[PDB]
Subunit: 396 residues, 4 copies
C-alpha cells in the first residue's frame, strides 16, 4: 500500500519494484498502478501460468500479466524432409479467422498426395557492422586485410561462443569510406540474435587494434549496420539469404487436383502468374507470394520466435508450373531466422508447442525449419487453389 502511493507521486519507478518487493508482487503492483492511471479494471491480463521470474529475466520488462493468443492446430501434415519425417500436427496461434482452416485444408490435401518435399538450402546468421575509415584508401586496405586474416578473425570470434562458428565474411560492402562487412556464422540450434553480436564485437575490437598497429585508424560505429539485414525487408536477404533458406515442393497429378482442390492445373498456373509473379512485379514487391507472412506469423507465435522476424519471412517466390501429368508447386523462402533453444522458446506455453512437434532442444532447428517450409506450402497451396476455383467459375 505505502508502495503504491510512491509510484503515483513518481517517487520510485516501476522498474526497481522487483528489487524492493518480490517479482511476483511487483507485477501485481504494476498492474494496479496502470489500472488507476487509466481508471479501468482488468480481469484477464492478470491470469498467467508462465513463470514470472525467468520471464522478467530473459523475455520481458515491466511485466503486468500476460496476453492470451488463441491456439489451434493444422494436420496431419506428411513431411518428406531430411530431418523431419512422418505425419505432423502443426500448432498455430492466431487471432485471424479462416487462417488455421486454410492451412488445415492444405495439410489434408497434401498428405493424401504423398506429402511435401522440403530441403534447407542454407543456414547462417549474419551481422554486418558499420566501420568508419578515414578514406576510401583505408577502406580498400581494410577489405584486403580482413580477407587475408580471416583465420585469425575466426579464432577471435569463435572464442566467445561454444556453439557459434564463423564461416565467411562476404560480401564486404564499401560506400565511400564506410565499410559493411557481413559476418556469416553457424549458430547451431539457436537463432543466434545475441550470439553473433558478442562474437562480432570481439572480432571488431580485434580488427580495430591490429590495424592500429599499421597506422590505419578505424572504429566501429555500430555492430548492426542495417546490412545484416535484421527485421527489415532487404534485397541482400533475398539473394544471399539469411537464417534458414528453405524450399518446399510438391508434384500433384491432374486427378488429385480435380478431386481435392476442385480446379485444374493451368488455373493454378494462371493465378500464380498473374498474382504472385506479375502482380508483385508491377507493384514492386519483394514478396512474390500470397500467404507466407500469415502462415509464418501463426507458427512463429506458437513456438516463441521473434515476432519482428515475420518481416523477413514474407520474402520468397511461389512457382506453379503446368506439367504433363499435373502441376509443379513450390515455395522458396530465402530468409527464415528460427531457433529451437533460447529466446521465446523457453516460455512455458511456447515450449509446449515445440514439444508437440518433437522440436524443442538441440539438434532440432533444421527439423523445425523443414516443418516451417512444409506448413507454408500447405497454406499457400490451399489459397492459390481456392483462388483458382473462383478463376474457373468466373471464366464461364
Amino acid at each position: 500500500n505505502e508502495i503504491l502511493e510512491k509510484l503515483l507521486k513518481k517517487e520510485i519507478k516501476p522498474y526497481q519494484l522487483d528489487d524492493l518487493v518480490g517479482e511476483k508482487e511487483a507485477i501485481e503492483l504494476r498492474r494496479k498502478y496502470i489500472e488507476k492511471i487509466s481508471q479501468v479494471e482488468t480481469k484477464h491480463i492478470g491470469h498467467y501460468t508462465i513463470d514470472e521470474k525467468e520471464a522478467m529475466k530473459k523475455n520481458i520488462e515491466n511485466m503486468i500479466g500476460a496476453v492470451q493468443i488463441p491456439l489451434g492446430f493444422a494436420g496431419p501434415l506428411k513431411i518428406n524432409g531430411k530431418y523431419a519425417n512422418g505425419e505432423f500436427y502443426v500448432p498455430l496461434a492466431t487471432t485471424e479467422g479462416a487462417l488455421v482452416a486454410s492451412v488445415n485444408r492444405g495439410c489434408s490435401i497434401v498428405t493424401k498426395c504423398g506429402g511435401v518435399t522440403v530441403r534447407v538450402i542454407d543456414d547462417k546468421m549474419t551481422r554486418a557492422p558499420v566501420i568508419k575509415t578515414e578514406s576510401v584508401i583505408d577502406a580498400v586496405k581494410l577489405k584486403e586485410w580482413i580477407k587475408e586474416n580471416f583465420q585469425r578473425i575466426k579464432e577471435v570470434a569463435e572464442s566467445t561462443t561454444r556453439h557459434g562458428k564463423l564461416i565467411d565474411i562476404n560480401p564486404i560492402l564499401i560506400v565511400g569510406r564506410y565499410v559493411y562487412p557481413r559476418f556469416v556464422y553457424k549458430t547451431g540450434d539457436a537463432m543466434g540474435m545475441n550470439m553473433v553480436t558478442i562474437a562480432t564485437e570481439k572480432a571488431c575490437n580485434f580488427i580495430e587494434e591490429e590495424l592500429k598497429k599499421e597506422n590505419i585508424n578505424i572504429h566501429t560505429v555500430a555492430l548492426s549496420g542495417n546490412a545484416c539485414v535484421d527485421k527489415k525487408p532487404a534485397g541482400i536477404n533475398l539473394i544471399e539469404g539469411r537464417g534458414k533458406s528453405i524450399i518446399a515442393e510438391v508434384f500433384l497429378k491432374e486427378e488429385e487436383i480435380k478431386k481435392y482442390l476442385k480446379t485444374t492445373s493451368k488455373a493454378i498456373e494462371q493465378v500464380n502468374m498473374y498474382k504472385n509473379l506479375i502482380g508483385s512485379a508491377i507493384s514492386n514487391s519483394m514478396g512474390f507470394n500470397a500467404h507466407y507472412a500469415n502462415i509464418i506469423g501463426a507458427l512463429f507465435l506458437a513456438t516463441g520466435q521473434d515476432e519482428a522476424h515475420i518481416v523477413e519471412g514474407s520474402l520468397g517466390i511461389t512457382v506453379a508450373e503446368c506439367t504433363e501429368d499435373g502441376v509443379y508447386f513450390s515455395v522458396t523462402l530465402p530468409d527464415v531466422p528460427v531457433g529451437t533453444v533460447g529466446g521465446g522458446t523457453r516460455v512455458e506455453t511456447q515450449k509446449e508447442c515445440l514439444e508437440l512437434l518433437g522440436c524443442h532442444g538441440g539438434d532440432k532447428a533444421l527439423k523445425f525449419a523443414e516443418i516451417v517450409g512444409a506448413t507454408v506450402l500447405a497454406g499457400e497451396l490451399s489459397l492459390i487453389g481456392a483462388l483458382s476455383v473462383g478463376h474457373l467459375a468466373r471464366a464461364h
Copy 2:
C-alpha cells in the same frame, strides 16, 4: 472418451467435434488428441480465461487452448497529437528481453522533453484485384470506363457497409491485357480486411456486368492481385501508403541530449546516416529504420492486430538531423494497418490492453495510430541514442 477413439481411427475429424460435443469440451478433447499422437502431456496451454465460444466463431479453428505472451508496459509517454494528448502507458507484449526496457527508456527521455508531436498523414485500406481482359485494347477501355463511372462503383461498394466508403480507385495498373485497379477505402475505426473484400467483390461483379453490356468480356481472377499490397513489403505501399500513414517528431536541445541520452547531436546524426540511410540503401532495403518492426510487433500483439501486418509496419524512414539548437528526430511509417474494432481486438486480453490506452471502440482508431507512431519514435530514439554513445566511446 468413446469420442477420443473415433478421432484416432480417423472416423471423425477434429473439426466436427464442436457440433457433436460442446465447444468448451471439444477443446479439451482435441487437446488430448494431440497429446496422444505426439506422446507429450500439456499443462499450460490448457489454461485460458478467454471466451472459447466467440473465439471459435471469429478468431480461430481447431482450438486446443491458448498461448501466453508476456505483457509489459513502457511509460510515461507524453503525446502531443491531434486525437491523443497527455501522458500514456503503452502496453507491450513480447518474448524479447531488453525490448520493453528500450521503449520505456525512450518514453522517459521523450517525456522530459515536452513529448512527441505525431500526426496521421493518411488513413485508407486498399484492395487491388487482378482482372483479365481479351486485349490491351479492352484493358484501356476498362481503365477509362472505371474512371468515368467512379460514382456508380462507389455506391455499389458502399451498399455492403455502413462504415466503409470508397474514395478513389487509383492507380490503375495495366500489364499487357491484365488490369490491377487499386480500390481505396476509408474504413473508419476498423482495419477493414474483410470489409474491403466484400465491398470490392460487389464492385467487381458490378463492373464485370456493366462491361458485359458493351460486349467487352472481362473477369476477376482474384480479389487480392498482389498490388494491394497486403502482408508483403512493396514499393506501392511505401509511396502511395496503406492503412494509417503516421509521422512523429521531437525537438531535443543539446542540453537534453547530454543529460538524458548521454551523447552529442552530431553522433545521433552520424549513426542515423551511416546505418539507417546509407546502410539500408546499399543493402537495397525498404526499411530505412532500426527498430520499427520490433516496436510495432510488441504493440500489435497486445492490442490484437494482425501479426502478419508487422511486415508492413517495418517500412519507413528515420530522419535525424543536427540543428543549431540540438537535433531533429522523426520517424515516418507510411504503412501501418490498425483498427480498434473487429478482428483480434475482440479477444479479452487484447481488448483490455486497448482500454488501458482509452482506444477500444469507435472514434478511436486515429487516437491509436498516433500512439503507435509516438511509441515507435520513443523506441527508435532510445536505440539510435544508445548506439551513438558507443559511436562516441570507440571514436576516442
Copy 3:
C-alpha cells in the same frame, strides 16, 4: 591563328571563350588541336562532321571538338496496328553492338508475316517532384492540403510559362518528417519536356511559397528535382505511376506460325519467359522483368536523337508470354519511356533524318513515335525469346 593556341597552353584564356573571339567553326578546330597537343596524339576522323556546328554549340553541346559516329542500320518491314502509327515501317537503329539489328530485323519479319503488332500508348506525361522544407510535420500536412485545394490556382500560374505544357495533376504528395515531395504531372505535347516542366514548376513553387507566407506558414524549396521525379534513375514510382510515355505492345501467334517462323513451340516460349524474365529477375531483385528493352531502346534512341540517359528508364517493364488455346500471347509493357519529336537531340541533322524516315519529325507525331518504339521492342523481344526457346527445346531432347 596559332598565337591563340599558345595562350590556351599557358592557360591565359579558357576553351569556352574561343567561340566569341574566333568563329565557332574555327573555335572547334582550335580546341581540337589543343587537346591533340595535351594528350600528344593525332586525330583524323572526329574532325569530320556534316552537322551544323552553330546550332549544336547553342542548344546541344559545350566545348565541341568534333563528332562521334555511331553506325546506323535498319530493321523491317514492321507492320504496326496502332491508333497513330499504321502500316509497314523501316525502323532506323544506331548501335555499336553486333547481332542487335539482325535480331530485331528477324522479329520484324516474323511479326509482319503474322498480321503485325497491336500497340497502344497507355499514358503520356512528364513529371517533376521538388523537395520542400517545412518547419514541422504540422506545417507539411497543411502544405499538402493547401496544394490539393488550390490546384486550379497553381495550374494557372504553371501554365502561364508555356504554350504547349499543361499541368494535369499534383499526385502523389509524399511527406517524410517535415519535408514534402509533390509530384507535378504535366502533359508536354510533342516534346519530352525536360526544361518545360522545370520552368513551369519553378514558377509554381514561387507562387506556393508566397501564398503560404500569407497564412503564417514559412516554407522554401530546396531543389526542383527532389529525386522523386524520378529522372534518369531506376525507381519504383516510375514503374507504378509511370513517366513519359507508357506503352504496351502485343501479338497473337497461332501454334502453326510458331513452328513455321520461330521454329519452336508455344509452351517453350512461355517457359523461357517464366524462368528468365519473371523468376530470374525476381530472385535477383531486378526492376526489369524483360530481356532486351534497354538494348532496343538504346539503338532506337541514338538514331532519333533522344536523351541517352533515359535509356535507364526505358529498361523498366514486364514481358508477358502466355500459352493460349490457339497458340501464344506475347506482350511487352514499358511504363517509363520519355520520348519526344521536337527539341533536344531531335534537332541534330542526322537524328532529324532518322525521324523523317519514320514520318515522325515535328508536331502531332510523338504518339506515333511512341507506338513505333513499342512495336520495335516487341519485335526484338520476341525474336530473342524465340531464339532462346529453340535452344530450350534442343537441349531438352
Copy 4:
C-alpha cells in the same frame, strides 16, 4: 544499279543479301536509297561517314545505311589521384544534351584547384548467370554442391576458350524451386567481356550438363542469360555483389574552398544531399541514390564506344556528402560500371580516338579508364549538388 533497286522493291531479294551480291560499300548506298524510296524522303547527312564500313558490318552493325553524328566535347582539367591514373586529364564527352558538358567542366576546374579526386577500383569482374532446369529441388541442391566441389574442373573448361578470361568464382548460386541460377564470375582483362563470358559459360554448361549425366542427374540449360546476370537492367544483385568495375571517388574540401569556388557552405551541401539524394530516392523506392550518374556515364560511354544499354547499370550508386570539422567530405560510389578498352564498340574509329585522348586504348588500360570514369562522375555530381545548395541558401 537500277535493276537491283527494283528487285528490292518487288521483295525479290532481301536487303541482308546485298553485301554478298554487291560490294559492302555499295550495298550501303543501295539500302539507303531503298528506304529513301519507301518513306519518300531524301537524306543528306547520314550518308557522310569516315569509319571503315567493312569492319563495321563484320563486328558492330547489320543492314548499315550510314552513320549518326553525336556532338563531341570535353571537360577539364581534371586532376585524378588514382592507382593507375594520375595527373590532370581532359575527358571527352559526347552528348546531345545542353548544359551537361558545362556542369562537368565546372566541377573539373573546382576539383583541380582543391588537390584532385581520390578514386579507387573496388572490384573488377564480369558475370554471366544461366538458368538451369532440374527435376526437383533435391537435384538442384546436388547441382549446387557439384558446382562448388568441381570448380577447378569447370574453371579449366571455361578458360580453354580464351587466353584473357579467367573464371575466378561461381558465387552466388541461387535456387528457386527446381531452377538454379549460378553466377559465373569472370576476370575479363581489359575487355568488357560480353561474348567472352558467353562462349566460356556455354562450354562450361555443356560440361556440367554431361558430367551430371554420368550420375543420372538430368539437367539442361534453358538460357545462358537467366536474367540474374544482371545485364542491362537495374538489379539489386549488381548493387550488392557488384558487376563490371566497382568504383569509388572522393574529395576533401575546406570550408574556405567551398565558399570561394562553389559559392556555398558545407552544411548546405550536406542538407541537399540528404533531402534529395538520400531521403528523396528512398521514399520513391529508387536504386539510384545519386543525382547525375547516368547523365555523365552516358556522355562518357558514348564518346568511348561503350555499350549504350549499360548506362542502365551506371545509374546505380550512392553519393555521400558529410559535414566535417575542416569542411565537407564528398564521395560517389558506383558499384556497377561495365566498361572496356578493347573489343566491342571501342574499335570504331571515332571512339578509338577519344580513348587515345585519355591514354586508355588497348591493354593494361581498363583500370585506368575506370578511375577516369569515377573522377568525372564526382566532378559532375559535385557541380550539381553545389549549384543546388546555392539556391537552397538563397531561398532560406
